[PDB]
Design a protein around this ligand. Structure first.
Ligand SMILES: N[C@@H](CC(=O)O)C(=O)O
Ligand SMILES: N[C@@H](CC(=O)O)C(=O)O
Lengths: 327, 327, 327, 327
């Protein structure tokens, strides 16, 4: 009758609690996986669920080590289950989802979910999000779509999905290309699938890696200090992502530091602090002249994911641009 | 019998050009204020326009010296004109508009305007933008609303307005509280005004300042380096704004560096990389314990503006939090 | 000492139920106001609540009689309570809210609330919505803002608020002018108030009315039948609202019928089926010539509310247009 | 070595003019196809353009006869050109686009385009809109995606695309599933394609039809008259689409009239006035019990298109539901 679904838990508000149902204060990742699952008894109606705790952190402390652990656990356990759900904080779910989207080689459903309200709160969103994530992970139509995020009755691809609001339960949106499908009464009408290459159609293989190249992010604004970019350069960072103003534009002092870094081997990706649309070529910056790479619709944090992985294969800026055009 | 409107030009793509109407490439600041005005002769039908070129730069290079020049100029010439229009780049127009919103003591109309397509482009947006900006600055109903941005037939308050898309003509949106008015056929239906204190209702007086407090911005993401934050501390920054994940949260190592900076005198404001919603008190971070200030709906670059101005009066976190609750 | 808040219950999904927490099927009309109050014991911490069941219906069956009951009851009982919450279906909440916004003379807080998920749903939104609505009604800052809708942690004015999505908990938005305030941890930051005249600043007085003028709505689209329009004219309707295409345009057949209906004393308002933006004058329809009124930002169902009240005082198109310009 | 592109002109503002650059008044369908092409000399860099005038109307007067003309012309001429662009009014572009999406059996690019500003107006959108539409028609990657709409640098599928704002140049959005691609510097990065069946994958064949089944639309609101519904049933309409309240709900007297109509043969689809989201099954309305069909994400004007074409083939409500599940 029912699919075997593995829940890999990482913490987040979905496993987090406070002293009151009406007070906003909470602490993240106190609740273990077994307690989350038992708190939604209806999951037994749609899946045989096995829970495993990988870590128990707030996703604001998410890191490369947890990413390597998840990618390897999924790639190892692919043939032992029918699909995966990862419980995770909201704050960096959009980064973990895109990392997994590029490094998981299982094309069974892999679904991430979180909660914007603590499990102890009035009208807690976590129970029904988990229910719907398992509905998604259990649906054979979810296979081959890449890694997914299921939040607020919506299935979102891992590349485009991002947090649009600090607090709203409806915060996760695919702000450039839209969602893949909507969940109603336990059924999904998929109308889209991401054309960017994911999972088994990428060359990225972290099976034998215990660390990732070092990539930092710098912000642009009026009168922006070069000290952030200089500090990453002085530490020998492999790459730097610019959170540019407008269409990936650089403050004078930041342009100058990043131009000199790119000349000496630092991979430099222009992204934007602006929440939708592409950082394009052919605007005000001659990328080929400086050795810069344009991020396209990848926001800074998503550009960092792809750049880190691109640096596992190449330091050539032409080849990194080709990777930013395909993944 | 028409109003006297002064145009203060600072450059931007509105004044910019490329070598083809169809290709996207361009350079800012190729067109001076007199050519810009003369190219829109319909302005003569609604105002008597005088143009002064204040600077000629891309707004990616906007800085404190241009802010101080603009505030002092508008404050000095308030009694000589009926209204102001400031032509500016799009990329940091939301920063400049908020600075002027807090330091301009002239409650006559002050309206900022730019363009997403260069002046040479097919279907250039600059002309009708500039026209709508003068309509707005000529409308007696625009006075006392604080500094405004006029873009795509819409009147936006300087505090909430932000660039939502890298390339779209419709990019400027007041994403939290909505616009003030819509322009149709040179008439505005104003249904809103900003409740936060602006212009003559703020204590910020830059009339005798030649420099502003040093405030930098650090980005949060998975595995974030503390190095950028350490570099700003080590340089003696007066303040640091954090572009937090989710509801203004910080990666572990950034948290530890900013907690220590706040303890030892650095002003620290938690904002969010998330494009809409407040960074709130009473969530995961005990602000009162660390001496941190929560930015509310101010995005990192806007939080920087207010923190620079707060630091001209106080270094006390309870008093900076009061400022972030009123302006 | 906690404020006295009266809940006037009308039914809705918030008082709706189905057979299962996970199945989407539900019914309304079954569940009493004391059950909603019991789902939210935390109410006792913020107010002295008294519940009255006025009717128990799905708001898809909302009607003139319920509106008149509600306005008269709020106006009679104003000096007996400190604020009102109205529990109501989602589907026509934007119509009731605007009727009450025009007809209520009580300037104490009047807050409507519903739920997008039935009370029986996993992660039901009704409990926290109702809590936040009582917060809003208890907030002295909520007085003098007109009639409010509180949904998904957001305070929305009764004029601009509309249901944007069929199923999403985040459906309610003030799509043209934006919300008034956001609610976090039981506190509101109000940054806006509606400039259009409401409540005690309107001349609409239904205290002695037992019915309202008959006003119907016709839809425009390719090849539209004039029959719906001709049926309302033939039944001697007092007014017709057109849900126009684009900027309130009319299919040729519908134009002809409405042009005739206006000449024989039917009031005709052009609104739009487009969900945001004004139906303007000075576009493709000469309203003055035909005796039509342009709805501005009022959508068809909101235009019907103001037209019905306009017709309690005048049948003159110029006077109705002025009313559509002020309320 | 350029593609041959045929422009089929139907009228619209994009061919429309007013008495000034600066007043909003205009009349639609003045200029001819040859004047439109000559305004955009740049088209010669990207295509060999041939224009034909099919009609010269405001799209507010679009009708079944124009739709049958357009479908047959495209189907006959498919082998004579590399791609089609259709110039059209904005108001009903979303209807013609979906009709052609179901009935066109040419899988070469078919692209619709319009303009929200008059050709004579300052910063007219029409010229760069046509340029971009010809870019899209000439892109071999546009084939096999169904009939497209190109507006504001965006490629939108003919099923989801809708006019979201009355006046904004950015009005056209695919509000449920998002755009297919974005156009920058005359290039398109496609990242999506519609999964719903279109063009050569639909059984709809209009090649021999001179008429379409009669399908009318009724609007729901508080106190809705049943008289529009009764007028269509008395005229012996083949189908009726309900613009329902919320999730496709009906006012009681409309429900009763349409339940009776459905039992006696009339095909009834529940759609929604709400601008986004699906009208679902398994909510408050037992569709199978009344013989009703749920429209899904199809809005009322889009639901009419598909119900007209379904009625060319079947009047069985079960089979019509299957059609609403597949196209
Ligand atoms: N800070 C928490 C927030 C939550 O999950 O809503 C996290 O990302 O783990
Ligand atoms: N009424 C015009 C509107 C426009 O095209 O902007 C039309 O659809 O023909």
């Amino acid at each position: 009758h029912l699919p075997n679904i593995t829940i890999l838990a990482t913490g987040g508000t979905i496993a987090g609690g406070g002293d009151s149902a009406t007070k906003s204060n909470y602490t993240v990742g106190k609740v273990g996986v077994e307690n989350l699952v038992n708190a939604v008894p209806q999951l037994k109606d749609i899946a045989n669920v096995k829970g495993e705790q990988v870590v128990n952190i707030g996703s604001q402390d998410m890191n490369d080590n947890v990413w390597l652990t998840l990618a390897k656990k999924i790639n190892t356990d692919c043939d032992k289950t029918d699909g995966f759900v990862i419980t995770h904080g909201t704050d960096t779910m959009e980064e973990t989802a895109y990392f997994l989207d590029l490094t998981v080689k299982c094309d069974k459903p892999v679904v991430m979910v979180g909660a914007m309200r603590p499990s102890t709160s009035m009208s807690a969103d976590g129970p029904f999000n988990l229910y719907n994530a398992v509905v998604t992970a259990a649906d054979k139509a979810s296979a081959n779509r890449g890694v997914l995020v299921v939040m607020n009755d919506t299935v979102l691809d891992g590349r485009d999905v991002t947090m649009t609001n600090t607090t709203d339960v409806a915060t996760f949106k695919s702000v450039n290309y839209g969602p893949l499908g909507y969940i109603h009464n336990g059924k999904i009408d998929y109308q889209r699938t991401p054309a960017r290459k994911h999972t088994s159609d990428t060359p990225f293989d972290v099976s034998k890696l215990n660390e990732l190249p070092k990539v930092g992010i710098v912000y642009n604004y009026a009168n922006a200090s070069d000290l952030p970019a200089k500090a990453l350069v002085d530490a020998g960072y492999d790459g730097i992502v610019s959170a540019g103003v407008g269409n990936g534009n650089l403050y004078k002092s930041v342009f100058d530091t990043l131009a000199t870094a790119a000349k000496t081997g630092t991979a430099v990706v222009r992204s934007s602090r602006v929440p939708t649309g592409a950082t394009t070529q052919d605007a005000e910056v001659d990328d080929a002249k400086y050795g810069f790479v344009a991020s396209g619709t990848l926001n800074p944090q998503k550009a960092r994911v792809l750049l880190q992985l691109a640096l596992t294969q190449t330091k050539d800026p032409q080849q990194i641009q080709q990777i930013f055009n395909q993944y």
